[PDB]
Amino acid sequence: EDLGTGLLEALLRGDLAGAEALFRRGLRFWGPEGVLEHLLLPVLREVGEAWHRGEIGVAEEHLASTFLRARLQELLDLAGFPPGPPVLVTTPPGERHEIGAMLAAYHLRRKGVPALYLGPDTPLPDLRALARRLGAGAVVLSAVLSEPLRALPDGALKDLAPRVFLGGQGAGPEEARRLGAEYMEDLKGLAE
Numbered sequence: 001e002d003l004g005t006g007l008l009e010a011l012l013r014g015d016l017a018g019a020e021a022l023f024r025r026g027l028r029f030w031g032p033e034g035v036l037e038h039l040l041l042p043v044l045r046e047v048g049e050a051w052h053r054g055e056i057g058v059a060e061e062h063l064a065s066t067f068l069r070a071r072l073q074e075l076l077d078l079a080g081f082p083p084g085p086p087v088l089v090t091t092p093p094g095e096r097h098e099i100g101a102m103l104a105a106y107h108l109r110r111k112g113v114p115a116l117y118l119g120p121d122t123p124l125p126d127l128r129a130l131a132r133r134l135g136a137g138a139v140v141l142s143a144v145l146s147e148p149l150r151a152l153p154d155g156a157l158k159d160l161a162p163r164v165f166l167g168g169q170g171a172g173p174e175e176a177r178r179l180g181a182e183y184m185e186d187l188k189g190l191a192e
């Protein structure tokens with residue numbers, strides 16, 4: 001069954017219980033890895049398109065995204081967590097597109113990297129506090145809009161953790177240099 005349209009429609013009409021039944025069916029079909037890329041991400045992108053066509057209000061959108069993000073954490077929670085200093089993954093303050101981040105987190109988790117997906121738009125002061133408190137080995141940011149990066153002062157990301165990586169269609173070597181992070185175009189950041 002195309003659970004995509006089903007999960008989609010169940011989320012657009014607020015049927016959360018029903019959405020969980022469809023997500024669970026998708027999980028049994030492709031397992032975690034697949035349900036993410038095949039069901040979760042696509043439906044999330046859909047939910048986002050809908051709001052970008054006025055065909056959806058804010059409360060409905062955030063309700064859909066809250067569910068999708070929760071299913072993501074359950075998928076991540078499924079497997080153990082590898083040893084090593086945690087890697088915090090989020091998006092820059094002001095950035096609400098998180099699919100890039102979700103993929104980075106998942107890809108890293110699939111390669112044995114202890115990635116902790118924090119969800120999007122985390123305030124620098126908090127991210128820094130959390131990176132320090134946990135002994136995070138690295139911080140990974142996904143930028144889809146350039147403004148959020150262009151809004152930060154020089155070297156704003158330098159102090160976050162031992163290593164800071166930036167990627168996404170709104171990041172580039174230039175903004176990374178300016179901010180104190182390492183730029184990376186493809187997800188093969190697995191090696192670091």
Ligand code: B12
Nearest residue numbers: 048049051097098099100142166167168169184185186187
């Ligand atoms: C979904 C979406 C939303 C959703 C997202 C929800 C969510 N939680 O994710 C929502 C509804 C919330 C949203 C909001 C906005 N967005 Co929007 N929307 C989109 C849409 C449809 C897709 C973006 C997306 O999810 N992209 C996914 C990227 C994330 O994934 P990817 O492609 O696969 O990326 C790859 C690489 O980038 C890389 N990568 C990514 N990250 C990283 C990190 C590292 C370290 C590495 C190595 C690699 C890497 O790997 C990925 C490959 O797998 C586009 C339309 C479009 N044009 O595509 C916009 C778009 C991004 N949204 C857009 C805008 C402007 C907005 C809003 C500000 C709308 C508005 N105009 O008011 C709002 C934000 C609300 C606000 N006031 O703050 C514009 C952006 C303008 C610009 N280019 O500068 C777009 C382009 C729309 C358009 N066509 O005009 N949006």
